[PDB]
C-alpha cells in the first residue's frame, strides 16, 4: 500500500475526516510535517492536537544510539507494567518525578488516555470524600457528585461525559449524571478589574450555592486552568484562588486537568505553578506521551486512599512501556536544554506578534491572548475562523480552531523566532482575503 | 538505577503490589520470562494478563530487519492517528480486516485502552437506540440502560464501572448507573441438558422482563462469551442464540467483549464465531496490543449512526501508532503459521492434562474445563487456590487467579506441547503440598 492509497484503504474500514496530506515519518522533523504524496512541507503549529513536545523526529532522540537501543527493547513488547517492572519503567518514573514532580504530591499512578486519567482523579475523589464523610460521622453513600465549569473539556469517556460541555455533538444521546455545573468567569477584553471581580463573585456565588444544596455529596471541583477546547479562555489567579479556599470549607479535593496545559507549554511544568493555587490532584496526559495523575495534599489525610489500598485504580498495562521510554528521553531534552525558559521567551515573542496583528487589523484579530506558547485569538464569526483556517492550510500552516469563534496555536516547545514569524506571514496574507 | 533498585524507585511513588522480579527486556523470550536479579526463568501461563499472544520477544519479530526499520519509524513519534494518516496506520488496518475482520462488521474504531474499547461500543449503541427510537416516533431520550450479566467484567471506566460485578473492591463507592442485571447460566459440573435448560430459561425470564418494565429504554445487551475475570465461566451457544433473539424482539443490540476471548485464544479469530451467534459490535483489546470496535449487522439500519457521523466518538490519538505496527507483523505471523489451529491442537492437549488431574485429584481439583487455550479448573476452598498459586511460584510458574476459586491458564499461542507438560508437572508437584 503506497501514499497515494492511503485514504482508499481507510476508507473501506472507517469514516476517513482527517488532514488531506499522508505524513512521511521518517522525513518531517521539528517544526515542520511532510505529506508522502507531494513532498510538500508543512508549518507545524498542530503538534498532534498539542501532544508533540518537540515535534517530529527531534535530533536528541534520533542520533542518541543507545536510545535506540532503550526504545527497540521497549517497542517489541508489551508488558503490563502493573503487575512486572523494569529498569526502563523506574528510569521513567524517577525522571518524570524530577522533572514535572511537585514534592507536595508524591502519588504517582500512570494509564493510557487523557480520559481515564481525569477519571482516576475522579476516583480518587470518590473514594475519599465518601471515606471522609464516613470518618466524621457521615453516610458513606454520600460524595458522588463533581462540581465543574461552563466550557469545560475533560474527554470522552462515561465519567468525562459528564463534565465536558462544548459542542453538542460530543455529548449528545450519551447517558449523564446530574452534576453542577457553575459559569467561568474567564477573562475578556474590555473588563476592567472589578468587572471581572464582580463575574467572578457570581461564579463564586453559584459555586457556594452548590456545595449547600448538596451537602456532603460533592467530592470534587475540577478545572482546566486554562480551557482549550472551549477556546483558550484563561482565568485569573483570584479565581482559583477563591475556588480552592471553598473546596477546604466544603472538604471537597481540586483538580486540575492539565492534560493540554501542562508539560512546558505555558512556561512552567504546569500551569497551576503560575496561579499560586496548590491543588490536591493533577491530571495530565497528551506531551508526557503516558497519561495518568498525580496526588497528595489533602488526599493523604485519609489513610485508606485509593494510592494506599492495592487494586481500587488499575488497567491492564499501566500505560504503555514504549510511551515511557520515548517521555523519559524528552524530558531529560527538556531538562537540559532549558525549554521551559524557552517557552517563556518565545511565547511573550508569539504573543507581542498577534497584539501587532491586532493593532494592524483591530476589526478582525480579535482578543489576542495567551500564556507561554499556548497563545490564541479570535475572529467576529465562525464563518471568518473557518475560512482563515483553510487560507493557511493553502499556505501549508496547520493550526486549530476552538470553539466557535478561536484559532488556536499549538507550536512545539522547540519552535524558532523565525518559525513563529512565518506562521505569522501567512496569518497576514490570509486576512485581506477572509475580510 | 540497577534491577535490584527497582522496586525502592518506584516505591517512592507508588504502590508496589506486582510480581517479585525484575523483568528482562532481552533475556526473556518465548513462554519464558527472565528475572533481571536472578537471572532464573519463569514459565509464563500469564502473558502479561493474556495480552501477549507470541510471548516475549518472537523471533519473526526480532529477526526482521525490515520490521525494525518500519518500528523504529513508528515508536519515535506518536502522531493523533484520528487527524494525521500514515501508510503504517494503513497496513494495520487492512491486516487487521484481512486476518480478524468479519464482512458483517465493516465499521472499525480504534482506540488505546479495553475500557474505552468497550465504552465506544456501548456508545455507539446509545446513539443507535436513540436514533431508532426517534425514526419509530418513540421519545429519543429513551436508549439509556444497558443488560449485562453477573459476574461480569468489562473495565474500571466510568461506564464499565456500571456493568463490572465480581470483586467489590473495584466498584465500591463509585458512582454508578441503575442497569439492569440478570443471573448468568454457566455451565457446571453435574448438571444435564434439561438442568442447563432450566438455568437457561431463568436467565432468559429475567432478560425478558428487564425488556418490557424499561420500553424502549434498554440499548443493548453486552457480555464476555466466556467469562475471564469472574472464573473462566462458559456458557452454551443455546443460551446466546436465544439472547440474540431477544435483542431482535426488542430492537436492542448484542455487543460481545472479546478483549480476553479474542484474537486467537480459544482457536478462532473471536470466540463468538465458534458459538454460532452474530453480534452487532465486538469489542477487543488486550492480544491486538490496540484496542478498539468492530460494528455492523443492524448498527448500519440508522444512516446516522457514529460510524458514519464526524466527531461522535474519538481521542487524542486515535490508537498507539507503535502497538498498530507491532499488531500488524503479529497478525502475519499468525496467519503465516497457523497459530488459531496450533491453539485449537495445543489447547485440546491442555484441555486433556487436565482432566487427566481431575482423575487423580477428585477431591482437590474440580472442573476442569475450557476453550483452545483458554482453560481453568477450580479448588475447593479460596485458601486452597491461594496456596496453590504460591507453590507455583515457588516452582517458577506463574498463572494466575480468577473468582473465589479458580486458576487460569493463559499461555502464548505458540506455547508447546513440553511447556505444557512442564505446567502440569508444577501442579502435580505442589497438590500434595496444599492438600
Known amino acids: 500500500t503506497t501514499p497515494d492509497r492511503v ?17 512521511d515519518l521518517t522525513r518531517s522533523g521539528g517544526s515542520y510535517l511532510v505529506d508522502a504524496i507531494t513532498g510538500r512541507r508543512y508549518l507545524d503549529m498542530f503538534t498532534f492536537v498539542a501532544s508533540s513536545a518537540l515535534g517530529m523526529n527531534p535530533p536528541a532522540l534520533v542520533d542518541d544510539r543507545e536510545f535506540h537501543a532503550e526504545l527497540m527493547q521497549a517497542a517489541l513488547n508489551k508488558p503490563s507494567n502493573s503487575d512486572v517492572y523494569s529498569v526502563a519503567m523506574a528510569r521513567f518514573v524517577e525522571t518524570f518525578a524530577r522533572v514535572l514532580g511537585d514534592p507536595a504530591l508524591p502519588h504517582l499512578f500512570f494509564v493510557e488516555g487523557g480520559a481515564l486519567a481525569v477519571e482516576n482523579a475522579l476516583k480518587a475523589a470518590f473514594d475519599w470524600k465518601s471515606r471522609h464523610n ?23 469517556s462515561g465519567y468525562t461525559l459528564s463534565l465536558t460541555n462544548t459542542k453538542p455533538t460530543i455529548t449528545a444521546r450519551f447517558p ?3 452534576w453542577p455545573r457553575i459559569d467561568a468567569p474567564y477573562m475578556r477584553p474590555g473588563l476592567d478589574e472589578p468587572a471581572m471581580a464582580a463575574l467572578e463573585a457570581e461564579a463564586l456565588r453559584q459555586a457556594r450555592a452548590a456545595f449547600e444544596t448538596r451537602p456532603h455529596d460533592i467530592a470534587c471541583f475540577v478545572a482546566e486552568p486554562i480551557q482549550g477546547e472551549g477556546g ?76 494506599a489500598v ?24 527538556i531538562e537540559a536544554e532549558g525549554l521551559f525558559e524557552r517557552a517563556v521567551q518565545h511565547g511573550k515573542y508569539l504573543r507581542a506578534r498577534l497584539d501587532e496583528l ?28 473557518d475560512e482563515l483556517i ?17 484559532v488556536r496555536f499549538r507550536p512545539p516547545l522547540t519552535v524558532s523566532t523565525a518559525e513563529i514569524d512565518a506562521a505569522i506571514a501567512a496569518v497576514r496574507s490570509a486576512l485581506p482575503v477572509v475580510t
Chains 1, 2 share one sequence.
Open 358 to 385: 491586532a493593532a494592524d487589523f483591530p476589526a478582525v484579530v480579535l482578543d489576542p491572548r495567551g500564556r507561554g506558547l499556548m497563545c490564541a485569538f479570535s475572529l467576529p464569526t465562525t464563518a471568518d475562523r
Open 7 to 23: 485514504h482508499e484503504v481507510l476508507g473501506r474500514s472507517m469514516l476517513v475526516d482527517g488532514l488531506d496530506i499522508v505524513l
Open 134 to 156: 464516613q470518618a466524621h460521622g457521615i453516610d458513606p453513600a454520600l460524595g458522588t457528585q463533581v462540581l465543574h465549569l461552563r466550557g469545560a473539556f475533560h474527554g470522552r
Open 310 to 333: 492495592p487494586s481500587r485504580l488499575a488497567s491492564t498495562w499501566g500505560g504503555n512501556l514504549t510511551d515511557m521510554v520515548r517521555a523519559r528521553r524528552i524530558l531529560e531534552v
Open 390 to 406: 483553510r487560507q493557511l492550510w493553502q499556505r501549508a500552516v496547520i493550526v486549530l480552531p476552538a470553539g466557535a469563534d478561536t
Open 176 to 178: 449523564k449524571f446530574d
Open 232 to 307: 483558550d479562555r484563561h482565568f485569573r489567579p483570584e479565581f482559583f484562588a477563591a475556588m480552592r479556599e471553598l473546596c477546604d470549607e466544603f472538604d471537597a479535593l481540586l483538580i486540575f486537568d492539565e492534560v493540554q496545559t501542562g508539560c512546558g507549554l505555558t512556561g512552567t511544568a504546569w500551569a497551576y505553578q503560575q496561579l499560586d493555587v496548590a491543588p490536591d490532584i493533577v491530571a495530565f496526559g497528551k506531551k508526557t506521551q503516558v497519561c495518568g495523575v498525580m496526588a497528595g495534599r489533602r488526599v493523604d489525610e485519609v489513610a485508606d486512599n485509593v494510592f
